Every structure is written in structure tokens, then in C-alpha cells.
Design a protein around this ligand. Sequence first.
Ligand SMILES: [Cl-]
Ligand SMILES: [Cl-]
Ligand SMILES: [Mg+2]
Ligand SMILES: [Mg+2]
Lengths: 436, 436
Amino acid sequence: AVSKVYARSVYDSRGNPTVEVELTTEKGVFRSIVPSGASTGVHEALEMRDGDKSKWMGKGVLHAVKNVNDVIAPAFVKANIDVKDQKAVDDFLISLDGTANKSKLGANAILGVSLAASRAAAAEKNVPLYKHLADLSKSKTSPYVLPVPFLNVLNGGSHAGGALALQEFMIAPTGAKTFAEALRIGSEVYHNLKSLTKKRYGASAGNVGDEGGVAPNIQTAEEALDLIVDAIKAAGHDGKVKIGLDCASSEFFKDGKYDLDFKNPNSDKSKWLTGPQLADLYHSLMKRYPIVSIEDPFAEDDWEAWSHFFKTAGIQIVADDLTVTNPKRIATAIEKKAADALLLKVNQIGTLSESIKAAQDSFAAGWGVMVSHRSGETEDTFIADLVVGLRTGQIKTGAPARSERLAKLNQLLRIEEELGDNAVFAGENFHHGDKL
Amino acid sequence: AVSKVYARSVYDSRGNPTVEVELTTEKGVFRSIVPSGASTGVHEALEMRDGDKSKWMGKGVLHAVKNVNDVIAPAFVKANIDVKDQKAVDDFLISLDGTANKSKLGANAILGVSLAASRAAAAEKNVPLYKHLADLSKSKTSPYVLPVPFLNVLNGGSHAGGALALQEFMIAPTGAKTFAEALRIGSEVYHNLKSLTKKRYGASAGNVGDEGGVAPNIQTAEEALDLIVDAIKAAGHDGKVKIGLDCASSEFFKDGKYDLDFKNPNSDKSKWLTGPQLADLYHSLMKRYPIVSIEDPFAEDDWEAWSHFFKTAGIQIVADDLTVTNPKRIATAIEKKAADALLLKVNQIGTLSESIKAAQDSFAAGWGVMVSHRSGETEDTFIADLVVGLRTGQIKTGAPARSERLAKLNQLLRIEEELGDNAVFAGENFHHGDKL
Ligand SMILES: [Cl-]
Ligand SMILES: [Cl-]
Ligand SMILES: [Mg+2]
Ligand SMILES: [Mg+2]
């Protein structure tokens, strides 16, 4: 029985405010912190921002906090809802908002409460969070599955100087026998990579981006890939570590063509590519490097490009901007066979219930689900329990640097330990961890 | 009653393993993570590192962990000590190790249990951690004092590629009326500095160092100071934000002199300074900029340079490498009137009791105490409660970026809200927060 609902403003990993919510019941006080999403998006749930240029550069969340304290709290408390019933909880908040995009209350206000309720329910049931999550999602818990962590290690695209258009380069320690082992190997690689970067690109090159990876001035994709290969070798993990890529192609998509030199204000339209030309480029890289996952290879609305590439690509293809954790977009993607893996951002949708259904719908279609962090994260470890609870076998939660990232990885080490014999590391079979 | 003591290996903010301890009592499970120190030091407690080049680059903490699990645990559990009795707990641990620098068990194995114990005691007493810490240190609780945060924003010296010899540039929002307000102001200036840096030094300049600050290629101290002044003005916080510096002079101390171009292998010995010459340089800066605190202005053993500068300097003078949170070093510094503020790194000593005694000893001599994070931090927020419990009025815990930093800052916001009328923000009187 919830006796109180309260919110306050706290800071995310990048120094911007975000919402923190507190739910109190007879078992104690349960908290959740919302990562940073969108205030102005077409398909996503909207996060409410204060917009007062006089405070926090216009990024405050006092309005959103006020919605929780003064709008949601009274009603919720009065409603006397069973927190164990996540669905009723979420339906309640949704109805209160009454908008399709949670634009009345703000998706940041709604979500905080959604997740806190889950924490409360787990305490009530006297079980760990991931177990309660497994219950809510009807996932197999015999055994449970630990995910392969896709570690951000190097960044390109809008995150760095240099011509390199591809946004994220990650490592996936699929060859490990345990999560703890996958994490150690991953950390060794990262360290080796950091050192090589400093050596070749200069000390300043060691500074990290929002997610903990480095971002030297790289000029080509081969350059970056070679670098990573060298780090794996140096760490002595050849054959045990694969590469994941986030092309974030919507950033260089122009006039139906893809500008690989989008960084050049003077890019040559002559050289811009068509989706098929671009597809051929990726096929080439795939043939030369151990790439096992590719996210957003094509633009958000370029359905045709995605379907074409999908037909002949043999690795996991992840949809991020193409689907924006949106039910309608997911349905379209599925039907068109545009990809086979969905990057799940709880905050893009706004409630635990909807998030769960999105994953379910995805699994039902034979697709994988990569649970993901946001660039502006917090010390909240929810996602760690979520990836285990949904049994996806794969998570994207930053480099093995910056505590907003590590906090999740650490929670995973904890979970694995606790599960003992009752859990398995997804390893090479991460694409379908739910079916293991 | 403690029924179990357990340790595991987790990762610090830099991706290095560290020790995590958990203690169980009838009230629950209590945990703590140790920040990263030194496995080698002449005066600090020794952190135990595995040294196996085949794992974690030689940084594992399996041995330290085995020490907790196989040596400390059994003995601790059988001892049946009252956790409320912090002295008994620490005495027990110290004796068990039997060395003066905790080199048998490792300071990292010891500290974890010391801290965890404090958490369990707070729960038993049914009070927030900061209150228990207040009780333990005999601090004044009416009202309580929230500290001024010294936020790292820009780095030089070892941390950057320009000629700048000084290591840390921090801002301290003394002019705010509340901790929350000081934090908001602090964040605004940080954002503004980041923009300006990217603008003048290039986008790559926006990447952060270990502690969340930027590290552009700055050539002079004025250059850096003016940048900060500009950031403060851009943010509209003129007069409310002060500057704290960490010269880390030991880094450029050589042969009795101070080489300000130590980064240059071509430093001209004819330009190396004497303590008094260096003292003059600092005086000039203090004249031109609003510097209210200077850390390690002279080398760790250069007692004479320190005492002399101290005579004439009218600002807080902080001791770091000079004291290494060591009782003998502190006593010496006090006696020689070398500084008036001690940087406290709990991990440099190894136990909570000793840390408290060190602050007490410092307060007794009229000095201030700046509670500090380590470069390798964690999601553990112990230090936030500690600064409040010791009533110091000043904490050094990184830039307002990277969750291993914000976690503490966010913890303070919570403490502040909880205390309500019962607390006050140190503001301009941070030097003597204990006597406020
Ligand atoms: Cl994001
Ligand atoms: Cl340190
Ligand atoms: Mg993406
Ligand atoms: Mg220092």
C-alpha cells in the first residue's frame, strides 16, 4: 500500500537535471531515476523540460517534478492500486496523462513512478528485482540468461573530429564462459585500446566521450576497425571478442543518398551513395572483420534500403532510430522484414508495461532485443535487472568507464553471483537469448 | 549481530577492479565499495593488488578479496562485535592485520569492512548514515552543515598536453544560499566552460578526464584562469563563484627547484624556481583572480617552502601529498604551520576510526578538512554522508559530470532536502564549517 509519491530533481551523467521519484509503502522507500530522452521528437514519448533559459540552460525538470507531486501523487495514492499489478499501475498513469505521447504530464514524470512501483512490488513479493521482472514478462527462469555486454569503446560520427562517419564501435566478448569473465576480457581490451590510442593519436586522445569510449580523429572505418583488432591482439583475446557497430546513418542521409563525408562542409555529392552502394560497403567490412551486429545501417524512414540489405545480411541488424521504441514503427519494421533486433529504450516509450510489450512483440517475431542506456545516464541500475528479467542475452550500456555505465555492469556481476548454477551466459547465442 | 562478511570484486570508474564488501545482520545486507588508492606508497596504507600480468593488467584484487572472505570473515563473525562501536570494529581489523600500513591484509580489504560496519550500525540505530557519523565524530548537529562543493572543471599538469603545470582548476559556489542552488550554479558554469572550450580549442576538447573535467592544451595559468572567469561571466554568476587550485607541485619539483615547464624535455634550468620565487608567483595570481584555496603549492617534503608561504598567504592552504592522510605527517605539518586544511582520503588510512581521528586532530588545531574522492571512484556515496557527519563545509568530488561524481552530489541534495530547516549551507564560511 503506497502511502506516498514524491519526486525531486537530481543530475544525470552529463550534468543535466533529471527526475528522481520516491515511492513509499509499508516495506519502505523505493526510488528510480529517469535517464535523459526527448523533449521534441516525432515518435517518442516526450520528456518534459522547463524551458527557462535562466536556469540550467533551459533544461530544468521542475515542471515535470511538479506534475508528480501535485498531479500524480494525490490521485495515485487515493486510487489505492496494487503495485504488484504493473499493468494497472501503468494504465492508471496513462489515463491520467490522456495524451498519446505523455505530453501532458511528461514521459519523465510517468516513467519515474512506473519503475519505482516495480521496485516496491519486488519488495512486497520478497524477491530480487530481476525475478519480479521475469514474472511480469513471463520469461523462462530455468535457467536465467546473463547478457553479452556490447561495450562502447570508440566513437566516430557526430562524436568526433576526423572524417569517420560511423558513430559507435563496440566490442562483444562472446567467447567468454561467464559474464564476470566477459567483463574482465572486455576491460583488458579497453585498457589496451586506450593505451594504443594515446600512443598513436596523442595523450589528449585518451579523454572520454559521454559513454566512456575514446574518440580520436580517425579518418576511415578500416582505420578504426584495425585499431580495435590491434587492441584485442594486445590484450591476447583473439577469437573471443567480436565487433558491434552503430552506423547512426540517419546523420549522413541526405536527399535519399548517404554522405559518408558528411563532416566535410565541402562533401562531393558525386560520391554520395545509394542504399545499395552503401549495403555493398557494409558487406565488405563484414567480410574483413569479426562484425556480428550492425545498428541503423540505413536511415529512419528508408524502409527500402533496410529490407534490401536484410535479405542477404547474415548478422544481427538492430533498429534504433528506425523504431524509436514505438509500437507502430516496430510493427512496420517487422512486417517489412527491415531488421531482426530492437534496441529497447524504456524512456522512449514511458512505462515499464509498454516496454515489456514492445520486447514481447519483438520476441514473438523472432527478433532479438538489445536493452540500452541513454547518453545521459544515472547511477540507477534498473536496466541491469531488466536485461536479466527479459532474458534478452544482450545489453548496450557504455564503455567500461564512468560509473553510470559500470553501475550496470557491477549489478550484473552481482546478479550472476547470486544466480550461481541457475544462470547461463548468453555467449555466442546472444541474438536469441530469450529462446536459450 | 553480524552473521556474515563477504567480498567480491567490482569495477571502479576507470574500469579497474576494486573491492566490494557486504555485511549481513538481522537488519539486512550492508555494502561498501572501496575507491582506488595506492599499492605502493611510503606513507599511505597499502592497497593490495594481485600483480598477475595475465589478468586485469596486474590490477586484480582477488587476493584482497580472499583476505576478507577467508581471514577476516571467520574471525569477525566469531568475535561478535557490536557494529555501533566503530572503534572496536577498527581495532579488531587493525590487530588482525598486525602491520602498520595494513600490508598483510590490504587497506582495501580492511576499509570495506570498516565502512560497511558503519552502514549496519546506522540501520540498527535507525538513523541516516550521516547522523550516525555525526554521533561517531562528536560533531555539532544543530544545525547540520551542507558543504561547498569544489568542482573540478579543468585540468593541467600530468593530465593535459599543453605547457600548463598546475593540475586542478576548481570552482566553488560560495555565494549560493543552498546546496541545491550551489549545485545548479556550478553545473551552469561547467556547461558554459565546456562550450567555450569546444569553441576555442576544438570539439575534441570537450572530452573529459577521469574526474569529469576538460583538459585542453592550455599553455599558461592565466590562460586557464581567464577561461574560467569567462565561463563564470557567460553563465551570469559573477561574484558568486570562487576558484580553488591544486598545484600538485611535487610533480614539477626537482633538485630543490620548481620546473614550471616540466612537460618540456627542454626545460631551461635557468628558469627553475625556488620556493620563494614560486610563492611570489602564487601571490600575484591570488591578487588577480578570485582564488580562495590552493592545494600542494610546494613539494611533499619541502617543509620550508610551505611554512614561509603560509606566513603571508591569507587563503586556505590545502595539504594533499604533503600529509597523505597520515597522523605523523599531519602532526608535523600542524607543528610547522605549513597549511591550514587537510585533504582527507579515507582510503589513504584504511579505517573509518582513523579517518575520524585525523579530522578531529585537524579541527582541534584550527584547520579545515576537505573530504575528497579518489581518481578511481565508484557509485558508492559514503563520502557525501561523511562530509555532512564531520560537518566540514567542503568536499572535493569531481566535476558535475560522470555518475561516480554526481552520485555524491545527488546524495547531498537528498540530505539537504531531508534536513530541511535543520541544516545550513556553509557558503563563504566553508573553511570553518565545523565551527559554524
Ligand atoms: Cl541516447
Ligand atoms: Cl586520487
Ligand atoms: Mg543508435
Ligand atoms: Mg592533490
